[PDB]
Amino acid sequence: SMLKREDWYDLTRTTNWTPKYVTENELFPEEMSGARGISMEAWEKYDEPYKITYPEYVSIQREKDSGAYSIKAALERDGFVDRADPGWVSTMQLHFGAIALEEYAASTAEARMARFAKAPGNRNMATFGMMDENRHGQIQLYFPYANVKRSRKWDWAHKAIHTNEWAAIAARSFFDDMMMTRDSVAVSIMLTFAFETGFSNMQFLGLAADAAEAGDHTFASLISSIQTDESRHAQQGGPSLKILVENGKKDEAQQMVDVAIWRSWKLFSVETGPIMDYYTPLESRNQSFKEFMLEWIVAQFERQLLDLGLDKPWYWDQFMQDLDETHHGMHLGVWYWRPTVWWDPAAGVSPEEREWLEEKYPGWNDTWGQCWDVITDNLVNGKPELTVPETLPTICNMCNLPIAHTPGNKWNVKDYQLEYEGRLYHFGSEADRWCFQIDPERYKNHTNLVDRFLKGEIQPADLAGALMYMSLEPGVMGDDAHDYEWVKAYQ
Amino acid sequence: SMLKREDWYDLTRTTNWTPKYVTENELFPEEMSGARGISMEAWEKYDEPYKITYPEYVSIQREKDSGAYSIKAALERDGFVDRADPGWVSTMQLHFGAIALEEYAASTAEARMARFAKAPGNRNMATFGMMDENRHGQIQLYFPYANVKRSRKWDWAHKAIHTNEWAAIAARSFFDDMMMTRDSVAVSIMLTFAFETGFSNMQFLGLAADAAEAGDHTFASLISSIQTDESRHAQQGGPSLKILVENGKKDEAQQMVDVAIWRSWKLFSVETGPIMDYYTPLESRNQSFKEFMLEWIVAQFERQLLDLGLDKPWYWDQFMQDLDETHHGMHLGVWYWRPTVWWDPAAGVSPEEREWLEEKYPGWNDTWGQCWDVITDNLVNGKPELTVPETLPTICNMCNLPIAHTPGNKWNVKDYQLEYEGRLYHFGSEADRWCFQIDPERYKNHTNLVDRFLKGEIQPADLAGALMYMSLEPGVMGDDAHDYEWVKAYQ
Amino acid sequence: TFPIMSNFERDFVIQLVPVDTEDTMDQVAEKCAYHSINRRVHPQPEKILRVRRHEDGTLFPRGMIVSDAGLRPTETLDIIFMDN
Amino acid sequence: TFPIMSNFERDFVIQLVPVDTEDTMDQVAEKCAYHSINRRVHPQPEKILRVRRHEDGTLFPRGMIVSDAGLRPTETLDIIFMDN
Amino acid sequence: ALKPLKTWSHLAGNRRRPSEYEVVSTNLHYFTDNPERPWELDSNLPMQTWYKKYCFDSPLKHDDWNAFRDPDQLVYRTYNLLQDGQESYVQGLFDQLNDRGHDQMLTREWVETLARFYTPARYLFHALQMGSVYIHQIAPASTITNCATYETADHLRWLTHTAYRTRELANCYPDVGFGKRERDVWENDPAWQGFRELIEKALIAWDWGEAFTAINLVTKPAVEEALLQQLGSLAQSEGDTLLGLLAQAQKRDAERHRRWSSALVKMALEKEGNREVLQKWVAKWEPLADKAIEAYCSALPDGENAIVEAKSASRYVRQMMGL
Amino acid sequence: ALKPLKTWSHLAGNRRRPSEYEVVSTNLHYFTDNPERPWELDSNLPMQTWYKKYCFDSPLKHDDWNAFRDPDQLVYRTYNLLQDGQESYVQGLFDQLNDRGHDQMLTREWVETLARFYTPARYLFHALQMGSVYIHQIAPASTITNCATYETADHLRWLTHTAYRTRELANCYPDVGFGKRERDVWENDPAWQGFRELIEKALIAWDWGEAFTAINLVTKPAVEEALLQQLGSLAQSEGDTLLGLLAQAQKRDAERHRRWSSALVKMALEKEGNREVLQKWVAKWEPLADKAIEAYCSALPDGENAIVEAKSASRYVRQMMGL
Ligand SMILES: [Fe+3]
Ligand SMILES: [Fe+3]
Ligand SMILES: [Fe+3]
Ligand SMILES: [Fe+3]
Ligand SMILES: [O-]
Ligand SMILES: [O-]
């Protein structure tokens, strides 16, 4: 006979002791634990709501890989990827490059909590968390590797985060901030709660649906499998927030959440936004990126925050408005500067696409449309060179993303500048600037790509220089995904 | 540490003993064992060339199902089957109905050898054989069951072999002859060697390729998985033939092979033939059914027979010629009598289809084309009723398939009639008639569908009567697969 | 009422045809044609349909009746095109 | 040679524009336009391009030169359409 | 026009969405469609006669044998999940007890007991394999057949354990005869003859109901109580920890065969006359079992007790079925 | 234009088509790209300082740590295949020995030994889990990290066994304190203090090379020789067959950690000065291990011998690495 889990579970996480040959602070250094003056005993209240034990883990996850990997081997020799919509191929090439190594990096973050959390529950869950991201990183390398002979862009699944291409900088800027350079409690809040529970879970759901809809079942299976691992470790932040709120730190807890969500949203608005509203074919589109944000992301956050005794962040209304705008900026930025990324951006401004854009976002043609008008005439009128850039946009010093917003008839592009210790910083929103102001020691001597350019760190100090600096050469440098085929619609 | 298989394998099959409380003949009754006067000791020479042991089996086959079933669950909600070529859907509906319950029946056949073989090697292999067909039957029910709400034709995966529809009779006529009603040695020869090793292995390969090519990966995975189980038990016949030849029974061994192959070929020519040359789309076609027969079936048989000290069967040249003909007859029969089967036959005589037919089979339009000409005019000229029958074709008393052959300008349709004990039998070939003559006690009072009709066993004694007798009602009764859409090509 | 098996010329398949013991070969031929002519075989109206016993090639005159033919029930009959 | 950040009217994005310390506002405007006009913004030739400091809204005269503007390196500048 | 259904047509009135077990297992035999002519061939073929005689004319009768349902509800897919689990455990045992030199630690006396009482079991186990596989091919319904199918695989499973451990023992003690001597032990040792007679005789009971009783209700509990329960206990108390665990392992399979056996008997009892039919077959075979348990257990240490215990434990199996 | 490649660009000159292990495991850490500023933020962040100090400035040096290769070549997929196998075996043991009432059969004396010497191991095992997971996050290469990743999972694996068996023991003997008493034993029993001091101290060695040595080369063989080898042998000879097998099981994991440890040391020896670096760390920590093996094994029966055996077996691990 076997015990029922409930009967012996607690003993798995009954592992705290009172050190004696070294001191608590030496065993649990504050910079790594973030115990915040709250006692060991009070951290022992930490109670993960989703429980699992080693034998369950290896059994359940053995089956998950069996599936995922059999699906891939079964579908490999049909090579779906050779005949997929190219906005789809692009979606995939972007995903792998932006995520694979960061997923792997996430295991270190988990390892952070696994050693340094004073909550024994957290330490164990994070060990499983640590295994989870070992998987994600691993599988999200194994999968793209099937395509390395089709194009060098697939090498970026590995290489991207080893480069200074601007998107990779933006990714690392997010991740190192959220999960690599903070204490254990912090990571539990900023990564597992704010980012994984708040964004990347629901994103992965949508991404799997879209993969399916596109006829890519290898990828649909991949993504959906990974997604089933999420809540197991994504849960870790909640209990931490409970302890913090119940013990005199509601504000500190608030501040981390405020920072973690804004930073998540910015990165989300360049990675998911453009894909939803521009790369996925018109007839494959269930809802707008704004619709998806409001349904599956925003309400949940409010629900979570309310149940935890926290408030909506100060910037929440701004964030609402920004759903009409930010990602359209991000997409225009990416498309216009398309030689600077490692996938082919899809324009997504055909007439039919444009009425859809106009429906989901009333005022779009009156604003975003204007820029695209000029892009379009230029392409009709055999002047394609005015659709590629001769300079570098202003980079936000927080999110490391272009500073961009409404154009056209409702022009509202702003820079939330800040002078600090005789250096001028640039910020793409009030919130990005605020993130620096609450903790400047943390960002102060970081330099964005533009700073580097300006300081003589990029040599030759021209565009071709910036291209080598960013490890990009023809063949990975991105161009229009449908090879301009949407232009024929205007002649 | 573990032993290497080689070291202890023999002990798994060191299981014969000399009975004492009952007699050998009582323990191994000749009608069930077919020991043929050859001693127990001499049967112990039986040495299966592919070896496996219980722990290997359950481990390896656990993984096979994990895969196959995950592929199905992953692809289910996309419902490929709703948008597949209908010649494909038909191919599937025919396959399941003709094969599923017979596969399950094959486990009894295996069980036959597992109890009654005097070769201990055979008894064990047949136990694994018995498990194999338990799988095949089971999985080939689980899979079609996903479609029961799409059409009642899918119920035939279960129901077919419980009916008196003419194809089901033809199937059971083959299988009960080959594997259900013969002694153990016999089954090892006629089923595992002649049928499984000789036909159904290579067929399954082709069927999986075709499934893939059609964009049906659930089915491609299904078929190819089953196929990997084949040689494990398909091998059983060879060693039996060796023992028989080495011991004074070359002729008996010959005769079984001769019978088993012809009977296999006839059934093959109505099940696989039409599908290859008519249901699969023109541009999906790798080679002709005749090409496939010569490459993957015939040469192998000659190789097998030569290595075993046996001769090519007496009818071999006839069989060669018949590759130009038989299946075209079978397909015309099936199509013309399409309300009498449970899938929609695909005509496959569009102009482009017809030049392909003419290339693979020079003389086709001059012969088979003639009938199709008349069918075609009739359909152009708004007389569709002359393309459905008012009588029942002559059934062969061996193969229970229509008696049919070349039409048109090279007319060569023959009946190999035989009067025996004051009853007249009809036979679709010299070989079918010969199968009866070498062993008439085995077929004598069997009645084909036509015999039944003629004797008053089908009531009402009209076509609608024969339809109920065969359990067929509108909704499963078959019609033209592409709903006549190929007629537009002629106006 | 007598079952025979029709092997119609230039068709691909032998069929069950009920005939009458009283029928003439001519009338056998007609009853057969019904199931072959204009279904899978082209008419030949410069031609005459003859009836021969399939097993041995024996040609029956147009005018003889089934009763007198020496036929085994279910006997196969070739139905061929001729000028006489 | 002086880096500024161009926030061109009706464009969507701030851009890095090298200008010269010697340039007039007019000539700043021109160097900016190069990267916005006919790329993502429609020309307005009944209009005059003016330069204002983004942080506080301060409008520079067409004629003043960069040297005299009080600009921090990398300062963001609004480039707007006017009639005077 | 015939409408699409929610499930297979034969399962169409059920209220409960059928399960995997039901969908892949039920109403599969077709030879029972034409009791006058089981097989699509001449009706006087010896195999027609054999099924008519030994399946259809069985005194053990029911209107709807296809109604039978395995309590464990095994299908192929779940059979291999189960047994792969269980096999990892037993192959685990083999691997790790080897490593530790478990065979080296056994006494000369116990090594002699193994050769006499343990090894030759490959013959008895293979005989049950042949036994259950005959039930398979003559049972009147696919769900009965399947139970027999899996039990046949378990019987092969036990044989395989025995074959494997026989090498290991031969490797450790080359002068005992392990792997060479067993046939003569099986054929000539008084301890075995009880069983050999039980099983040889049982293996020629062709009637399916009599096959089921003789094999699954009479012979199996006797073989299991003697060779698994009594030998395993002995093994454990004699320092043979491998075999004590091995046997307890194989007894899991036995408990499962008993479960489905019980289920079948429960089902036969729905019909008047069947208890009497089953009880009569039991009374014919029980004496031979008694002889088997007597001849074997008595030659063990503490012999008389092993006989008493095994006799009533095997008896107990049938009492609980109501027989 | 850049041509498509046969494999990842970083693996491009190899001759051998890279393996799964290579494709998913190699050159993954990015914080080692900018030793001056590991992380995409300000370079004076405490975490910048920590990696600079404890990863980059390690006396244990190599030009290309990314060249490291796990001898067992574990990836996540094959880690779970392996351990699910091994877990079926151990959960098998638990299930079947229970069934048999194995805990009931143990003597009062041995039940006391378990509570003192066996149960409190949950603390020591969890401490190693924390130990190996720190190596993970500060090792200078993804292939080193991965080895530590899986070993952390094994450490949690051992803890979990211990936690489980502690309930079972508490269920069988409610008046012993199983599950309640262990912290006080861990914290206050002379038998434990050797180890507690070894591990508490080791857990604050931040330098990755020193962490690796202190944990994987010094502490682990001492914990493994004392708690698995000596306690398991004792268990077996004291009639505790479960724990004798359990411990032999967990020692499979230990042998694997030793294999990769050995591989790493072999690799460090390519570079002059590293043997001296490793030997110096060993000489600092070996005394604390000696104290651990002494304090623990001496309180066992036949105590002096357990100390001698464990001392030289753990020593042996390092001698074979050449250290
Ligand atoms: Fe992840
Ligand atoms: Fe995650
Ligand atoms: Fe099969
Ligand atoms: Fe087969
Ligand atoms: O994740
Ligand atoms: O098969």
mmCIF file with all atom_site columns, C-alpha atoms in Angstrom, chain B residues 1-3 7-8 11-12 14-22 26 54 57-59 61-62 65 101-102 104 107-108 111-112 115-116 123-124 127-128 131 134-135 138 141 145 148-149 152 154-155 158 162 172 176 180-181 441-442 444-446 452 474, chain E residues 2-5 7-10 23-24 26-30 33 37 39-44 47 51 75-77 79-80 83-84 95 98-99 122-123 126 129-130 136-137 142 145-146 150 153 157 159-160 164 167 183 186-187 193 196 200 203-204 206:
data_model
loop_
_atom_site.group_PDB
_atom_site.id
_atom_site.type_symbol
_atom_site.label_atom_id
_atom_site.label_alt_id
_atom_site.label_comp_id
_atom_site.label_asym_id
_atom_site.label_entity_id
_atom_site.label_seq_id
_atom_site.pdbx_PDB_ins_code
_atom_site.Cartn_x
_atom_site.Cartn_y
_atom_site.Cartn_z
_atom_site.occupancy
_atom_site.B_iso_or_equiv
_atom_site.pdbx_formal_charge
_atom_site.auth_seq_id
_atom_site.auth_comp_id
_atom_site.auth_asym_id
_atom_site.auth_atom_id
_atom_site.pdbx_PDB_model_num
ATOM 1   C CA . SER B 1 1   ? 23.916  -5.833  -12.974 1.00 0.00 ? 1   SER B CA 1
ATOM 2   C CA . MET B 1 2   ? 21.762  -7.420  -15.721 1.00 0.00 ? 2   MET B CA 1
ATOM 3   C CA . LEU B 1 3   ? 22.338  -10.422 -17.981 1.00 0.00 ? 3   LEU B CA 1
ATOM 4   C CA . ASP B 1 7   ? 22.643  -15.676 -22.172 1.00 0.00 ? 7   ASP B CA 1
ATOM 5   C CA . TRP B 1 8   ? 19.194  -16.650 -20.894 1.00 0.00 ? 8   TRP B CA 1
ATOM 6   C CA . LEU B 1 11  ? 15.520  -20.918 -21.238 1.00 0.00 ? 11  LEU B CA 1
ATOM 7   C CA . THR B 1 12  ? 12.352  -18.934 -22.086 1.00 0.00 ? 12  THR B CA 1
ATOM 8   C CA . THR B 1 14  ? 12.903  -24.573 -23.145 1.00 0.00 ? 14  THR B CA 1
ATOM 9   C CA . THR B 1 15  ? 9.394   -25.668 -22.222 1.00 0.00 ? 15  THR B CA 1
ATOM 10  C CA . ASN B 1 16  ? 8.507   -28.939 -23.973 1.00 0.00 ? 16  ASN B CA 1
ATOM 11  C CA . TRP B 1 17  ? 8.064   -32.038 -21.783 1.00 0.00 ? 17  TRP B CA 1
ATOM 12  C CA . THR B 1 18  ? 7.070   -35.622 -22.358 1.00 0.00 ? 18  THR B CA 1
ATOM 13  C CA . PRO B 1 19  ? 3.401   -35.970 -21.169 1.00 0.00 ? 19  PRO B CA 1
ATOM 14  C CA . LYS B 1 20  ? 2.552   -39.006 -19.063 1.00 0.00 ? 20  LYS B CA 1
ATOM 15  C CA . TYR B 1 21  ? -0.880  -38.559 -17.526 1.00 0.00 ? 21  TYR B CA 1
ATOM 16  C CA . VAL B 1 22  ? -2.358  -37.842 -20.977 1.00 0.00 ? 22  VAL B CA 1
ATOM 17  C CA . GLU B 1 26  ? -4.391  -35.787 -26.611 1.00 0.00 ? 26  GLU B CA 1
ATOM 18  C CA . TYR B 1 54  ? 8.395   -9.860  -21.926 1.00 0.00 ? 54  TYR B CA 1
ATOM 19  C CA . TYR B 1 57  ? 7.881   -6.027  -25.035 1.00 0.00 ? 57  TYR B CA 1
ATOM 20  C CA . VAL B 1 58  ? 5.830   -4.059  -22.490 1.00 0.00 ? 58  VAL B CA 1
ATOM 21  C CA . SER B 1 59  ? 8.419   -1.319  -22.376 1.00 0.00 ? 59  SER B CA 1
ATOM 22  C CA . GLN B 1 61  ? 5.049   -1.135  -26.809 1.00 0.00 ? 61  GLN B CA 1
ATOM 23  C CA . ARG B 1 62  ? 4.199   1.207   -23.974 1.00 0.00 ? 62  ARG B CA 1
ATOM 24  C CA . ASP B 1 65  ? 1.040   3.660   -27.829 1.00 0.00 ? 65  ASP B CA 1
ATOM 25  C CA . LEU B 1 101 ? -12.357 -6.963  -36.384 1.00 0.00 ? 101 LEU B CA 1
ATOM 26  C CA . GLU B 1 102 ? -10.176 -9.265  -38.521 1.00 0.00 ? 102 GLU B CA 1
ATOM 27  C CA . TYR B 1 104 ? -8.814  -8.739  -33.502 1.00 0.00 ? 104 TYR B CA 1
ATOM 28  C CA . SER B 1 107 ? -5.217  -12.741 -31.901 1.00 0.00 ? 107 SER B CA 1
ATOM 29  C CA . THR B 1 108 ? -7.263  -15.953 -31.771 1.00 0.00 ? 108 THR B CA 1
ATOM 30  C CA . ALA B 1 111 ? -3.602  -17.984 -29.702 1.00 0.00 ? 111 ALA B CA 1
ATOM 31  C CA . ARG B 1 112 ? -4.031  -21.056 -31.941 1.00 0.00 ? 112 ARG B CA 1
ATOM 32  C CA . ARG B 1 115 ? -1.390  -23.365 -27.403 1.00 0.00 ? 115 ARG B CA 1
ATOM 33  C CA . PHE B 1 116 ? -0.908  -25.851 -30.140 1.00 0.00 ? 116 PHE B CA 1
ATOM 34  C CA . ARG B 1 123 ? 4.364   -20.796 -28.760 1.00 0.00 ? 123 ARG B CA 1
ATOM 35  C CA . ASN B 1 124 ? 6.078   -17.811 -27.127 1.00 0.00 ? 124 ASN B CA 1
ATOM 36  C CA . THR B 1 127 ? 1.893   -15.057 -27.341 1.00 0.00 ? 127 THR B CA 1
ATOM 37  C CA . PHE B 1 128 ? 3.498   -11.762 -28.299 1.00 0.00 ? 128 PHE B CA 1
ATOM 38  C CA . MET B 1 131 ? -0.788  -9.250  -27.836 1.00 0.00 ? 131 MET B CA 1
ATOM 39  C CA . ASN B 1 134 ? -5.100  -7.371  -29.488 1.00 0.00 ? 134 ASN B CA 1
ATOM 40  C CA . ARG B 1 135 ? -3.467  -3.913  -29.993 1.00 0.00 ? 135 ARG B CA 1
ATOM 41  C CA . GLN B 1 138 ? -8.124  -2.244  -30.278 1.00 0.00 ? 138 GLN B CA 1
ATOM 42  C CA . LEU B 1 141 ? -11.383 0.745   -33.200 1.00 0.00 ? 141 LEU B CA 1
ATOM 43  C CA . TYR B 1 145 ? -14.504 5.992   -33.147 1.00 0.00 ? 145 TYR B CA 1
ATOM 44  C CA . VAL B 1 148 ? -18.903 8.370   -35.337 1.00 0.00 ? 148 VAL B CA 1
ATOM 45  C CA . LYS B 1 149 ? -20.733 11.739  -35.179 1.00 0.00 ? 149 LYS B CA 1
ATOM 46  C CA . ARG B 1 152 ? -22.723 6.369   -39.810 1.00 0.00 ? 152 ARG B CA 1
ATOM 47  C CA . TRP B 1 154 ? -17.716 5.024   -39.353 1.00 0.00 ? 154 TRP B CA 1
ATOM 48  C CA . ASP B 1 155 ? -19.867 2.624   -37.293 1.00 0.00 ? 155 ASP B CA 1
ATOM 49  C CA . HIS B 1 158 ? -17.146 -2.163  -35.769 1.00 0.00 ? 158 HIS B CA 1
ATOM 50  C CA . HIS B 1 162 ? -20.984 -8.610  -38.369 1.00 0.00 ? 162 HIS B CA 1
ATOM 51  C CA . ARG B 1 172 ? -14.215 -13.584 -43.575 1.00 0.00 ? 172 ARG B CA 1
ATOM 52  C CA . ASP B 1 176 ? -11.420 -17.888 -41.665 1.00 0.00 ? 176 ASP B CA 1
ATOM 53  C CA . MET B 1 180 ? -9.240  -19.409 -37.979 1.00 0.00 ? 180 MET B CA 1
ATOM 54  C CA . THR B 1 181 ? -9.962  -22.882 -39.250 1.00 0.00 ? 181 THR B CA 1
ATOM 55  C CA . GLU B 1 441 ? -14.627 -30.839 -48.153 1.00 0.00 ? 441 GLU B CA 1
ATOM 56  C CA . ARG B 1 442 ? -13.558 -27.415 -46.895 1.00 0.00 ? 442 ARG B CA 1
ATOM 57  C CA . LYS B 1 444 ? -18.450 -27.659 -50.473 1.00 0.00 ? 444 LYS B CA 1
ATOM 58  C CA . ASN B 1 445 ? -21.568 -26.450 -48.610 1.00 0.00 ? 445 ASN B CA 1
ATOM 59  C CA . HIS B 1 446 ? -20.515 -22.832 -48.357 1.00 0.00 ? 446 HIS B CA 1
ATOM 60  C CA . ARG B 1 452 ? -28.233 -17.370 -51.104 1.00 0.00 ? 452 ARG B CA 1
ATOM 61  C CA . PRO B 1 474 ? -29.353 5.017   -47.175 1.00 0.00 ? 474 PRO B CA 1
ATOM 62  C CA . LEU E 2 2   ? -29.356 6.879   -41.195 1.00 0.00 ? 2   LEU E CA 1
ATOM 63  C CA . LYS E 2 3   ? -28.187 9.556   -38.715 1.00 0.00 ? 3   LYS E CA 1
ATOM 64  C CA . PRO E 2 4   ? -24.670 9.736   -37.193 1.00 0.00 ? 4   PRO E CA 1
ATOM 65  C CA . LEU E 2 5   ? -24.547 8.288   -33.648 1.00 0.00 ? 5   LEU E CA 1
ATOM 66  C CA . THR E 2 7   ? -21.138 5.987   -30.017 1.00 0.00 ? 7   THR E CA 1
ATOM 67  C CA . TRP E 2 8   ? -20.958 2.532   -31.643 1.00 0.00 ? 8   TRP E CA 1
ATOM 68  C CA . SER E 2 9   ? -24.394 1.351   -32.687 1.00 0.00 ? 9   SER E CA 1
ATOM 69  C CA . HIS E 2 10  ? -24.198 -1.814  -30.455 1.00 0.00 ? 10  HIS E CA 1
ATOM 70  C CA . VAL E 2 23  ? -15.209 1.080   -27.110 1.00 0.00 ? 23  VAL E CA 1
ATOM 71  C CA . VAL E 2 24  ? -12.273 -1.219  -27.902 1.00 0.00 ? 24  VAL E CA 1
ATOM 72  C CA . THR E 2 26  ? -16.999 -5.287  -26.728 1.00 0.00 ? 26  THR E CA 1
ATOM 73  C CA . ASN E 2 27  ? -18.956 -7.523  -29.089 1.00 0.00 ? 27  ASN E CA 1
ATOM 74  C CA . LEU E 2 28  ? -15.907 -8.348  -31.260 1.00 0.00 ? 28  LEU E CA 1
ATOM 75  C CA . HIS E 2 29  ? -16.136 -12.056 -31.954 1.00 0.00 ? 29  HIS E CA 1
ATOM 76  C CA . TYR E 2 30  ? -18.000 -12.780 -35.142 1.00 0.00 ? 30  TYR E CA 1
ATOM 77  C CA . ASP E 2 33  ? -23.112 -14.738 -35.223 1.00 0.00 ? 33  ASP E CA 1
ATOM 78  C CA . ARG E 2 37  ? -21.952 -22.234 -39.201 1.00 0.00 ? 37  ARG E CA 1
ATOM 79  C CA . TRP E 2 39  ? -16.888 -19.756 -39.921 1.00 0.00 ? 39  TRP E CA 1
ATOM 80  C CA . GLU E 2 40  ? -17.289 -18.533 -43.550 1.00 0.00 ? 40  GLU E CA 1
ATOM 81  C CA . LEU E 2 41  ? -16.552 -21.958 -45.024 1.00 0.00 ? 41  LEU E CA 1
ATOM 82  C CA . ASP E 2 42  ? -18.120 -25.432 -45.155 1.00 0.00 ? 42  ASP E CA 1
ATOM 83  C CA . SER E 2 43  ? -19.977 -26.236 -41.876 1.00 0.00 ? 43  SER E CA 1
ATOM 84  C CA . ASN E 2 44  ? -18.483 -29.726 -41.446 1.00 0.00 ? 44  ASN E CA 1
ATOM 85  C CA . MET E 2 47  ? -12.988 -26.332 -36.660 1.00 0.00 ? 47  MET E CA 1
ATOM 86  C CA . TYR E 2 51  ? -16.448 -24.522 -31.818 1.00 0.00 ? 51  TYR E CA 1
ATOM 87  C CA . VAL E 2 75  ? -7.046  -2.729  -22.584 1.00 0.00 ? 75  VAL E CA 1
ATOM 88  C CA . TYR E 2 76  ? -3.741  -3.205  -24.322 1.00 0.00 ? 76  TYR E CA 1
ATOM 89  C CA . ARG E 2 77  ? -2.634  0.396   -23.723 1.00 0.00 ? 77  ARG E CA 1
ATOM 90  C CA . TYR E 2 79  ? -1.944  -3.351  -19.704 1.00 0.00 ? 79  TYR E CA 1
ATOM 91  C CA . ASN E 2 80  ? 1.469   -2.174  -20.804 1.00 0.00 ? 80  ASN E CA 1
ATOM 92  C CA . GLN E 2 83  ? 3.110   -3.987  -16.358 1.00 0.00 ? 83  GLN E CA 1
ATOM 93  C CA . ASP E 2 84  ? 5.906   -1.697  -17.464 1.00 0.00 ? 84  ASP E CA 1
ATOM 94  C CA . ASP E 2 95  ? 19.689  -5.327  -11.077 1.00 0.00 ? 95  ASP E CA 1
ATOM 95  C CA . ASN E 2 98  ? 22.803  -8.677  -8.091  1.00 0.00 ? 98  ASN E CA 1
ATOM 96  C CA . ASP E 2 99  ? 24.968  -5.721  -7.502  1.00 0.00 ? 99  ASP E CA 1
ATOM 97  C CA . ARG E 2 122 ? 9.202   -22.797 -15.763 1.00 0.00 ? 122 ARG E CA 1
ATOM 98  C CA . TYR E 2 123 ? 7.328   -25.883 -16.950 1.00 0.00 ? 123 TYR E CA 1
ATOM 99  C CA . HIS E 2 126 ? 4.430   -22.264 -19.337 1.00 0.00 ? 126 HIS E CA 1
ATOM 100 C CA . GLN E 2 129 ? 0.351   -19.897 -20.337 1.00 0.00 ? 129 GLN E CA 1
ATOM 101 C CA . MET E 2 130 ? -0.878  -22.613 -22.701 1.00 0.00 ? 130 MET E CA 1
ATOM 102 C CA . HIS E 2 136 ? -8.860  -17.022 -25.078 1.00 0.00 ? 136 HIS E CA 1
ATOM 103 C CA . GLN E 2 137 ? -9.611  -18.869 -28.297 1.00 0.00 ? 137 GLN E CA 1
ATOM 104 C CA . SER E 2 142 ? -14.464 -10.798 -26.720 1.00 0.00 ? 142 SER E CA 1
ATOM 105 C CA . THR E 2 145 ? -11.252 -13.503 -24.355 1.00 0.00 ? 145 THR E CA 1
ATOM 106 C CA . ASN E 2 146 ? -9.377  -10.281 -23.408 1.00 0.00 ? 146 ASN E CA 1
ATOM 107 C CA . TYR E 2 150 ? -3.679  -10.496 -20.582 1.00 0.00 ? 150 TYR E CA 1
ATOM 108 C CA . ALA E 2 153 ? 0.884   -12.443 -21.068 1.00 0.00 ? 153 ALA E CA 1
ATOM 109 C CA . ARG E 2 157 ? 5.780   -12.948 -17.623 1.00 0.00 ? 157 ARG E CA 1
ATOM 110 C CA . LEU E 2 159 ? 7.982   -17.977 -17.012 1.00 0.00 ? 159 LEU E CA 1
ATOM 111 C CA . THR E 2 160 ? 10.387  -15.225 -18.154 1.00 0.00 ? 160 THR E CA 1
ATOM 112 C CA . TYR E 2 164 ? 16.117  -15.267 -16.113 1.00 0.00 ? 164 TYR E CA 1
ATOM 113 C CA . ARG E 2 167 ? 20.680  -18.306 -15.554 1.00 0.00 ? 167 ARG E CA 1
ATOM 114 C CA . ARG E 2 183 ? 12.814  -31.192 -17.159 1.00 0.00 ? 183 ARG E CA 1
ATOM 115 C CA . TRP E 2 186 ? 9.331   -31.675 -13.512 1.00 0.00 ? 186 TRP E CA 1
ATOM 116 C CA . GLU E 2 187 ? 8.907   -35.115 -15.123 1.00 0.00 ? 187 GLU E CA 1
ATOM 117 C CA . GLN E 2 193 ? 3.717   -35.096 -10.094 1.00 0.00 ? 193 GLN E CA 1
ATOM 118 C CA . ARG E 2 196 ? 1.932   -32.271 -13.598 1.00 0.00 ? 196 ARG E CA 1
ATOM 119 C CA . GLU E 2 200 ? -1.656  -32.121 -18.269 1.00 0.00 ? 200 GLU E CA 1
ATOM 120 C CA . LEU E 2 203 ? -5.006  -28.822 -20.638 1.00 0.00 ? 203 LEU E CA 1
ATOM 121 C CA . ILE E 2 204 ? -7.249  -31.262 -22.497 1.00 0.00 ? 204 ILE E CA 1
ATOM 122 C CA . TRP E 2 206 ? -11.764 -28.385 -24.339 1.00 0.00 ? 206 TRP E CA 1
#
